[PDB]
Amino acid sequence: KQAILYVGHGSRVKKAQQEAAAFLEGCKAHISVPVQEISFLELQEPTIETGFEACVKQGATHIAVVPLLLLTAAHAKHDIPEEIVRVASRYPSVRISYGKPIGIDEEVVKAVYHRMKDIGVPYENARVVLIGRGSSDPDVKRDVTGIANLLQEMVPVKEVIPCFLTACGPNYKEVFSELEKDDGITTFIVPYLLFTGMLMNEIEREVQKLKAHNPNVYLSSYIGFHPHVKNAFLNRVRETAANSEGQFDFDGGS
């Protein structure tokens, strides 16, 4: 009766494909839903069309589409819903709900906290610099700032500075330029990313460059598919499947 359709954005890097597929597969045992299919927007199969049609072929009357996204931008608002309407037009009797990106969640703040703790340096009254990819969509900066504020409330750090690799300000290179000082305050750098790659490597090199000026700077590993990220995503899945007020009804559009 009920189905879950997981939708990742997809990758062409084999390791990223494998990690995303394995994560979504391991999610299934935590959800009491008989029909569950994984799919990806781009670059990686099963396609969204394939997964939706598989759900229908297994007899699903209700499909909960849950996007595996850290933040809310064009993928969550447009590309994925567009693919959903394209495939769903062929099955008008099937009810669809559509979930939210992870966004501002206490579990993800805990994931950031454990990445900080992994460095093994005291974090009390330390500065945190939270680097997101960035986007021209203001919701992305808004959500990263919200995550910084939640971290500020939950962990006794001096401050959390959200900044970005591209598209919106402040740029992380500007923050870095202002941190060449070394005033005795410890600064942790947390990359808010699901995968490694070119930008993560750039962050690594720039942190080396910064450490040449200020030795009290420590880069954590990127967040990745941390257990607390898994908790937050399972929260998204469960709330989308319950859809108790119809707030996740998939209405034609975005």
3-class secondary structure, 90: coil
What is the identity of the amino acid at 7?
A: V
3-class secondary structure, 212: helix
- Determine the Cα–Cα distance for residues 62 and 35; give it in Å rounded to an integer: 10
- Determine the Cα–Cα distance for residues 60 and 34; give it in Å rounded to an integer: 9
Helical H runs in the chain? 14-27, 48-57, 74, 80-88, 106-117, 138-154, 172-178, 198-213, 227-242
User: Which residues does 190 contact at the CB level (< 8 Å), separation at least 6?
Assistant: 112, 115, 116, 128, 129, 130, 131, 220, 223
Whether 9 has a binding-site annotation, put simply, is yes
- Determine the Cα–Cα distance for residues 47 and 40; give it in Å rounded to an integer: 5
- Nearest Cα to 159, choosing from 133, 193, 183? 183
Q: How many helices and strands (H and E) does the chain possess?
A: 9, 8
Q: What's phi and psi for 161, nearest 5 deg?
A: -110, 105
Whether 213 has a binding-site annotation, put simply, is no
Annotated binding site: 9, 75
Residues that constitute the known binding site for Fe cation = 9, 75
